């Protein structure tokens, strides 16, 4: 049973879905379950009581949204089962889980219990013929067509940098933080309350993400932007009430570089990139500096790559060619590589079959991934 396999690119922010051997994912929607706050007195209302995908995006105001995954670690397992069921259902894929093999994704250095419980869901509740779990960095390099590359990614949950060299992922050189797009959006919300405009509800939270996506930029020199007085640019809500953002637009993404702003001493994006290259072997460093690949949504800020270059120039050894590459399709880079990996004939050997899972259990899944 070797049908056209499915590529479920997981993530706390957005969940991409579709079939193998495609250019772009057809089914992209945000990873959250929406349930109504209010009472439904009047008949002919929105049925189901559980809202996932474009219905939830359309009807935010009703729904008390709650994210099942934080930092690539599913907290609420019932909510992820409903989302994965919604992905497979007639509203998106229009196919059964029994037909196609599954390509799952996870962030590196995650809890092994979550990986086991993920496999349990796909093998038992859904009846998958074969499952395979993979990393974000390996898939990003598949999409570009390279083998050598440091993959500095920045999603909604996790930021990390896996240094791969000619098809050799070094597991001990991996640097990871739990500071990313969601924490920047949460940090922007806190600033907007200090400015004046308060947002508190979960439906109301996604307005702050939309402000962060649209009107934010990274200053090349933050001390210079502090000393100077900002212009105070405007933004229109779905309501229509105007919001003067002020200095919070440039100070919000500084959480990525200075994680001491949230009050949680970590490395930072630029330090993680340097530390990943430094932890690897001596002869591999110059090739890893030349091949720096970007991916994820929190790399899309204005002047992000310019500042990320300047920080590498400050930290790294002098007179070395730094090249921070970044494709046009950064958001779907991980899905594209999964679709390419799924289309290859070697894919049949790498996966974990249902029969192999029933015999061995979790140990066989831990062996095949690494």
């Amino acid at each position: 049973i070797a049908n056209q396999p499915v590529v479920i690119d997981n993530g706390s922010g957005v969940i991409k879905a579709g079939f193998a051997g495609d250019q772009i994912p057809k089914y992209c929607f945000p990873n959250y379950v929406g349930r109504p706050k209010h009472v439904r007195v009047m008949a002919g209302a929105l049925e189901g009581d559980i809202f996932i995908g474009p219905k939830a995006e359309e009807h935010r105001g009703l729904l008390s949204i709650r994210y099942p995954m934080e930092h690539g670690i599913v907290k609420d397992w019932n909510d992820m089962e409903r989302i994965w069921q919604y992905v497979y259902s007639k509203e998106q894929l229009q196919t059964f889980s029994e037909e196609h093999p599954v390509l799952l994704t996870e962030a590196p250095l995650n809890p092994r219990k979550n990986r086991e419980r993920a496999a349990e869901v796909f093998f038992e509740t859904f009846n998958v013929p074969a499952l395979f779990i993979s990393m974000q960095a390996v898939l990003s390099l598949y999409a570009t067509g390279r083998t050598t590359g440091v993959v500095l990614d920045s999603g909604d949950g996790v930021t990390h940098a896996v240094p791969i060299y000619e098809g050799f992922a070094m597991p001990h050189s991996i640097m990871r933080i739990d500071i990313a797009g969601r924490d920047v959006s949460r940090f922007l919300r806190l600033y907007l309350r200090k400015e004046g405009y308060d947002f508190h509800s979960s439906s109301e939270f996604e307005i702050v993400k939309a402000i962060k996506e649209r009107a934010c930029y990274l200053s090349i020199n933050p001390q210079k932007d502090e000393t100077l007085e900002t212009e105070k640019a405007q933004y229109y809500l779905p309501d229509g009430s105007t919001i003067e953002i002020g200095p919070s637009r440039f100070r919000a993404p500084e959480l990525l570089f200075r994680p001491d702003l949230i009050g949680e001493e970590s490395e930072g994006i630029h330090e993680v990139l340097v530390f990943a290259i430094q932890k690897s072997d001596m002869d591999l460093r110059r090739t890893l500096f030349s091949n720096i690949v970007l991916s994820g949504g929190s790399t899309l800020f204005k002047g992000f790559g310019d500042r990320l270059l300047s920080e590498v120039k400050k930290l790294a050894p002098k007179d070395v060619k730094i090249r921070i590459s970044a494709p046009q399709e950064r958001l779907y880079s991980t899905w594209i590589g999964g679709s390419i990996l799924a289309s290859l004939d070697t894919f049949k050997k790498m996966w974990v079959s249902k029969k192999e899972y029933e015999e061995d259990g979790a140990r066989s899944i831990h062996r095949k991934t690494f």
Partner: peptide, 20 residues
Amino acid sequence: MADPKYADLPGIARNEPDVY
């Protein structure tokens, strides 16, 4: 190509100049 989010005029990469 089709889909909601893209960036126009960032470029593929930012590279330092190669010396002799």
